Design a protein around this ligand. Structure first.
Ligand SMILES: Nc1ncnc2c1ncn2[C@@H]1O[C@H](COP(=O)(O)OP(=O)(O)NP(=O)(O)O)[C@@H](O)[C@H]1O
Ligand SMILES: [Mg+2]
Ligand SMILES: [Zn+2]
Lengths: 129, 605, 110, 194
């Protein structure tokens, strides 16, 4: 079936909260107003509608560094003190898969990733794995 | 109101005294009135503009600088009028034919750190802003009225010298003298200036992750017109403002430009002295070769070929009108992971004009030129592809083997004739494509497989002939080279933190770029007579060798050896001479050209 | 594999998984799979994992608030390793193209 | 002070300077002629060159062969000194490219008067009015183009006008160095390059 759609208005700081292709989660006021173009298109007193936005989240970016709390940072930095943190992270990738420890290790290294750099300001090399 | 006129007069007087009194220097050496002398020399040259630095204005009178930052639209008019009267008292008396005083455009610049397009929120409206970007489109110059005179259509009364507001905003004609719209604008009795709209794309460094690059409309005025072309990188100082002719209370925004800074051709005499010294010192060729891609270990002959490509030969127009290309076309076939793409990414950065394209990401129209319908006019218009955007420069086609054959066919005219002939949609022209093609590709079988021979190349002979030099850069395993290369790579990765210091026996990238531009515009060499004799004889021996190899194989070689290769050697020698700013190519220059082409010909054995 | 060298060499990490028979390992794997199926009803680890919410927070923290620098990595050791890795690869069938594998090691250390 | 100075150009005078490199290069430029009598042994150059032959040969050689009786050859003006190009100069002297139209335009034109052409007066008046028209732009550009690329300004100028431009630039640079105090320092000569 064809999908339905709605227009939404972002104001002030909510602009640039999303881009095309973003699976957003939008809170807003469902607002309606008279529209003569829709009236002549439908032949009835049909009112256009738009969502006056009040919050935009994303359903893939469920966590972000701009939302991390001091307690989250504290427990993260406490976990890093453990000498088993590498093994814990490797065991934590796809825990419902038995074995494949080398695969989990490689995927952890790719998931965290290296550091991009540009020595001399003239020669780029990627950081991603 | 008299109080308002008093305020305007006081601010104009303060700007006048800034332009009259500002000095640079010290009592230990001396003083020069910077803006007085700039006004005098520019007016006597007929330039009628100056470039007032905001930092200098702040040092003289901080309140004026703050007012000009917060309210530039109000105060730039006063500053321009102040500059006009200062120019009058500085230049008069003037000779015959120069009695009438001319208006002065006060451009301005700043040392402040720039903002960005996505940083331009609503609170920046009507303020001075300084943003970087790339010009992607440039309008043709059009006339905008600065003062008009309007005549009543019925009774022929006239209102004259009505001041038009600057920028894209217009003026409302009065509805009282007669009819409801009594007036028409007199086309003769009005004064107009050049204006030009541009589109400034956000810097690729500045685009946030996952976003498309934004772009901003610019308005350039008077002497800012044609100061920048598409493909240039600029810092634009201007006034963020609304156009003033879905939703209701919305107005489109643009930047009224008042200062353009090309972030990277008029060289200073000091820079010219430096370039002449560089051309004069004996090992400039090796210095340039070391300066090209200094982070890339080895590949010194390929770097030398890239040097010859960057400097290029000399275009020649012969008595019958036929033109010979000076540009050098360089193909780099070979194994993967061999810094070919990095060398292309260096050349794009280093060439005075440089355009980087992926072969797989390109199309025939997008490379040469596109014909598209203008949405606002219904006519078909021309759009420059990469080879037009790179005219007078280098095209870096990476992953060149991934193009479809019909798209590689499109560049045949532009590679050799250096023109793009178009006959589409009723518009028929011959654009210029005076550019060098630097291409990179991998073997047919991934790595170069020596057992399969000529099957490692899928390119046609016709397009292979158009490349001046063809490198088959094989990746040959060797423990000593591998150890030294790995040490170089690891130290390079460690050196990402050490302040970007320079190196002995090397030219900085910016200085090398400017030196290439200087040598390109200045020097066009030729061959010496005995050098031409040597090249003639060696060409005969080379052609005989190629013919005998083809006969022994009983198969035509993939890479041909033709008159284009002779002329390729000619223009390589001319490029080597142009590095040294010599009017002639010696036997040694031809010898180095033969050596480079022999490396590129062993790669075709 | 049927892939070519220019596309193989761009992958920093190559992984091979084989479903070879080994009855003790098959018993362990099958018991774990049945355990997962009964555990997740709608209703080699030895270390215990993090909770996945904690792991997401950990990853997103580490990718922004941390930028590992490189100052010393035993250059001669890595260079010797890469050189004889190239020597052995020349005789066999996987492709350490020159710098990409060196930089893969640098990226993995980071 | 005792700096090197080239032998000055005497091209505008009744006769050019013997030792002037500029005059030598100026007189090297070729000049169309018609030969009035056949010349043996010179068919290797242009065995006899026949009578009535059109030739282009150097101005020094034309002056050498030319006697006022017009016994050996007749001398014809180059196109840039004939009436159409004189009219082009009369239109606006500032836009013509005297660097491309012979680099020694005024010197060649002045020595072209030696052959006693019937339009010598027209040539002389054209040269004088061309110089008068171009003088103000030369003066302003030379005396106000401070510390910048002078290539576009100096491009369209003949060698005499280029010398005037360099004189004006030298005066400007001298005064600016004085005003900024750099003239007081004692410095090594240009020969420190060696
Ligand atoms: N000699 C070298 N010196 C320094 N870096 C090198 C060298 N050879 C390869 N590299 C690095 O290897 C990486 C890949 O280089 P690249 O520019 O893609 O070579 P390439 O031959 O064009 N790869 P491909 O597109 O598969 O042919 C980059 O990080 C380069 O800096
Ligand atoms: Mg590539
Ligand atoms: Zn009226």
């Amino acid at each position: 079936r064809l999908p339905r759609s709605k227009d939404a208005i972002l104001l002030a700081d909510l602009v640039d909260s999303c881009k095309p292709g973003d699976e957003i989660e939008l809170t807003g006021i469902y607002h309606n107003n008279y529209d003569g173009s829709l009236n002549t298109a439908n032949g009835f007193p049909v009112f256009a509608t738009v969502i006056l936005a009040n919050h935009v989240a994303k359903k893939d970016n469920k966590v972000a560094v701009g939302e991390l709390t001091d307690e989250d940072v504290k427990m993260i930095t406490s976990l890093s003190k453990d000498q088993q943190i590498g093994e814990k992270i490797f065991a934590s990738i796809a825990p419902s898969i038995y074995g494949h420890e080398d695969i989990k290790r490689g995927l952890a290294l790719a998931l965290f990733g290296g550091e991009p750099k540009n020595p001399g300001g003239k020669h780029k090399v990627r950081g991603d794995i | 109101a008299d109080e308002g006129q008093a305020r305007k007069s006081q601010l104009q007087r303060r700007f006048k005294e800034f332009l009259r009194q500002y000095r640079v220097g010290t009592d230990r050496t001396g003083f020069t009135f910077k803006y007085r002398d700039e006004l005098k020399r520019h007016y006597n040259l007929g330039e009628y503009w100056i470039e007032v630095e905001m930092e200098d204005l702040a040092s003289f009178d901080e309140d004026l600088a703050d007012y000009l930052y917060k309210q530039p639209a109000e105060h730039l008019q006063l500053l321009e009028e102040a500059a006009k009267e200062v120019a009058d008292e500085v230049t008069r008396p003037r000779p015959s034919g120069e009695e009438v005083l001319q208006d002065i455009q006060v451009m301005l610049k700043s040392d402040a750190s720039p903002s960005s397009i996505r940083s331009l929120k609503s609170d920046m409206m009507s303020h001075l802003v300084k943003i970087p970007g790339i010009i992607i489109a440039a309008s043709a110059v059009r006339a905008k009225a600065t003062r008009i005179s309007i005549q009543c259509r019925s009774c022929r009364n006239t209102l004259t010298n009505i001041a038009m507001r600057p920028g894209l905003e217009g003026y409302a004609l009065p509805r009282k003298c007669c009819p409801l719209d009594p007036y028409f604008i007199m086309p003769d009795k009005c004064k107009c200036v050049d204006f030009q709209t541009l589109k400034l794309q956000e810097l690729p460094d500045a685009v946030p992750h996952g976003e498309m690059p934004r772009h901003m409309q610019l308005y350039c005025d008077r002497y800012l017109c044609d100061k920048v072309v598409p493909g240039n990188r600029v810092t634009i100082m201007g006034i963020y403002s609304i156009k003033k002719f879905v939703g209701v209370g919305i107005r489109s925004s643009y930047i009224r430009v008042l200062g353009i800074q090309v972030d990277t051709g008029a060289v200073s005499p000091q820079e010219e002295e430096e370039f002449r010294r560089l051309a004069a010192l004996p090992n400039v060729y090796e210095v340039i070769s070391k300066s090209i891609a200094p982070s890339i270990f080895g590949g010194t002959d390929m770097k030398k070929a890239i040097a010859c490509l960057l400097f290029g030969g000399s275009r020649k127009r012969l008595p019958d009108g036929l033109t010979r290309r000076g540009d050098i076309n360089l193909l780099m076939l070979g194994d993967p992971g061999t810094a070919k793409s990095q060398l292309l990414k260096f050349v794009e950065k280093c060439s005075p004009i440089g355009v980087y394209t992926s072969g797989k990401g390109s199309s025939a129209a997008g490379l040469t030129a596109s014909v598209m319908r203008d949405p606002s006019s219904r006519n078909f218009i021309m759009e420059g592809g990469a080879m037009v955007l790179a005219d007078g420069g280098v095209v870096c086609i990476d992953e060149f083997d991934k193009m479809r054959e019909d798209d590689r066919v499109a560049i045949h005219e532009a590679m050799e004739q250096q023109t793009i002939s178009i006959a589409k949609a009723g518009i028929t022209t011959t654009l210029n494509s005076r550019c060098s093609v630097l291409a990179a590709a991998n073997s047919v079988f991934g790595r170069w497989d020596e057992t399969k021979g000529e099957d490692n190349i899928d390119f046609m002979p016709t397009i292979l002939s158009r490349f001046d030099m063809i490198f088959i850069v094989k990746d040959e395993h060797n423990e000593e080279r591998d150890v030294m290369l790995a040490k170089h790579v690891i130290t390079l990765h460690v050196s990402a933190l050490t302040q970007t210091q320079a190196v002995e026996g090397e030219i900085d990238l910016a200085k090398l770029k400017k030196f290439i531009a200087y040598c390109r515009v200045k020097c066009g060499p030729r061959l010496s007579a005995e050098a031409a004799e040597k090249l003639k004889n060696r060409y005969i021996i080379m052609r005989s060798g190629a013919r005998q190899h083809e006969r022994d194989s009983d198969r035509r070689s993939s890479i041909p050896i033709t008159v284009r290769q002779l002329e390729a050697i000619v223009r390589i020698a001319e490029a080597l001479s142009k590095m040294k700013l010599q009017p002639f190519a010696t036997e040694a220059d031809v010898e180095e050209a033969l050596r480079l082409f022999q490396v590129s010909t062993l790669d075709a054995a | 594999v049927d892939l070519t060298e220019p596309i193989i060499s761009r992958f920093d990490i190559l992984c091979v998984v084989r479903d070879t028979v080994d009855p003790v390992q098959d018993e362990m794997l099958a018991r774990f799979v049945v355990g997962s199926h009964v555990r997740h009803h709608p209703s080699t680890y030895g270390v215990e994992p993090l909770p996945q919410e904690v792991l997401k927070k950990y990853i997103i923290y580490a990718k922004e608030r941390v930028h590992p620098k490189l100052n010393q990595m035993d250059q001669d050791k890595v260079a010797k390793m890469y050189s004889d890795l190239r020597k052995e690869s020349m005789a066999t069938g996987s492709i350490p193209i020159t710098v990409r594998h060196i930089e893969s090691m640098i990226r993995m250390a980071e | 002070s005792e700096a090197y100075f080239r032998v000055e150009s005497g091209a505008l005078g009744p006769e050019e300077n013997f030792l002037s490199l500029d005059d030598i290069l100026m007189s090297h430029e070729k000049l169309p002629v018609r030969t009035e009598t056949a010349m043996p042994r010179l068919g290797a150059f242009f065995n006899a060159v026949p009578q009535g032959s059109k030739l282009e040969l150097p101005l020094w050689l034309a002056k050498g062969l030319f006697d006022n009786k017009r016994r050996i050859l007749s001398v014809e003006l180059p196109k840039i000194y004939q009436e159409g190009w004189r009219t082009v100069f009369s239109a606006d002297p500032n836009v013509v490219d005297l660097h491309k139209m012979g680099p020694h335009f005024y010197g060649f034109g002045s020595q072209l008067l030696h052959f006693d052409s019937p339009e010598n007066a027209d040539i002389s008046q054209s040269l004088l009015q061309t110089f008068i028209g171009r003088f103000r732009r030369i003066m302003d550009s030379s005396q106000n183009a401070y510390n910048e690329d002078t290539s576009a300004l100096v491009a369209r100028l003949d060698e005499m006008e280029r010398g005037l431009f360099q004189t004006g630039q030298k005066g400007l640079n001298d005064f600016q160095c004085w005003e900024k105090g750099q003239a007081s320092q004692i410095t090594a000569s240009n020969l420190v390059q060696n």
